[PDB]
Amino acid sequence: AAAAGPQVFDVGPRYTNLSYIGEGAYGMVCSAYDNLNKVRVAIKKISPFEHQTYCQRTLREIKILLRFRHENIIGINDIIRAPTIEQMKDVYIVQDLMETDLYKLLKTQHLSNDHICYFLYQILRGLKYIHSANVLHRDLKPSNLLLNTTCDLKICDFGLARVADPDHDHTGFLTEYVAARWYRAPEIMLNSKGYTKSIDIWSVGCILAEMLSNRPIFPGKHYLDQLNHILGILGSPSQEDLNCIINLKARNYLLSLPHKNKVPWNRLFPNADSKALDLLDKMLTFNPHKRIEVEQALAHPYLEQYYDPSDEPIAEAPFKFDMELDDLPKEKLKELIFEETARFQPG
């Protein structure tokens, strides 16, 4: 039983020279030498079967990532688990080794306008595929964007992902949310469950702004502070935009706030390409109805060096129906995880 910061990191025959590369979700991550493909790889140990919540996120992510096949979405190369449900306590997920992520890179590295353009292009190319599969990522943030040494970008972490459900998106004011505060669309704090594609475009807009300055654009300390940060830059919502918020607690909260004028993007980002700020403006639109769609963003002039819709594939097999994991008991979720991982068994 090969050990790492001894705990058990027991990874097949084929995965050797374990080097600890931090902590993940329900276990730890280590790089290793894939003795078959003769390439170094990332292996995540997942230990979720105790907690119903851990089981749902683990299954959701595995079902999505095995169905997706796209250059800008992290793939599962392999899954190591016991041959029986009884012996299965841990799952190991093998993925392409990505040396860094955009969080780590933004902490220390200035991005050129060309890198910002290329990274955004790749984010939106992967997001087009995701949305075309009727899936929302719901937790896009720099740490969920993996990069290698040749600047290939892959979206990861579909733990909070859901099938899109715009018909059922409405909710009351101050409804609890799980996804990273700083990347939350304004509507999440007002009247949205985050079941529409527009919530992911907002997150990408936030990431673009963070790429332009190396600092999060809306670093809210609390749930309503998130809103204050947003309205500090976009200014008070228009009457028309308020008219779309029929929820009285949310509308009267917004009406209670002092009037704020829009801060021009060119004032926050004086060194930024004007086309990037044009596209940022359209991604960070208050009204989710007026917010640019992924395919429109790809067609924006900022991305004209890369834009090729024939080379921006969509999903063959969208998740047409809700994945009803909400109140399956753990034991059902462990069996589905077992069944979902079966294709990787010599067995």
Per-residue HEC secondary structure of 99-128 comes to CEEHHHHHHHCCCCHHHHHHHHHHHHHHHH
Task: Specify the resolution in Å.
Answer: 1.6
Whether 32 and 150 share a structural domain:
no
Query: Which CATH number goes with the domain that contains 166?
Result: 1.10.510.10
User: Which value, in Å, is the radius of gyration of the alpha carbons in the chain?
Assistant: 21
Query: Domain of 60?
Result: 15-97+327-344
Whether 134 and 64 share a structural domain:
no
Q: Which three-class secondary structure state does DSSP give residue 235?
A: coil
Whether 167 and 36 share a structural domain:
no
Separation between Cα atoms, residue 72 and residue 308, nearest integer Å: 15
**What determination technique applies here?**
X-ray
Which residue positions form the known binding site?
21-29, 44
* Residue 188 lies inside a defined structural domain of this protein: yes
Whether 80 and 224 share a structural domain:
no
Separation between Cα atoms, residue 123 and residue 127, nearest integer Å: 6
* Residue 7 lies inside a defined structural domain of this protein: no
Give me the number of domains the chain comprises.
2
Which residue positions form the known binding site for ATP?
21-29, 44
Separation between Cα atoms, residue 320 and residue 231, nearest integer Å: 35
* Residue 8 lies inside a defined structural domain of this protein: no
Whether 116 and 220 share a structural domain:
yes
Answer yes or no: 139 catalytic: yes
Whether 22 and 84 share a structural domain:
yes
Separation between Cα atoms, residue 95 and residue 11, nearest integer Å: 13
Closest by CA to 85, choosing from 333, 334, 325, is: 334
Contact between 49 and 89 (Cβ < 8 Å): yes
Separation between Cα atoms, residue 30 and residue 229, nearest integer Å: 37
Whether 42 and 156 share a structural domain:
no
Whether 66 and 127 share a structural domain:
no
Q: Angle at CA 267, nearest 5°, toward 264 and 270?
A: 130
Catalytic one among 90, 96, 101, 139?
139
Q: After which residues is the chain broken (C to N over 2.5 A)?
A: 6
* Residue 26 lies inside a defined structural domain of this protein: yes
Q: Convert 287-305 to b/e letters by CB count within 10 Å (16 or more is b).
A: bbeebbebeebbebebbee
Contact between 287 and 245 (Cβ < 8 Å): no
* Residue 10 lies inside a defined structural domain of this protein: no
| Token representation of residue 120 | 């955004």
Residue type, 237: P
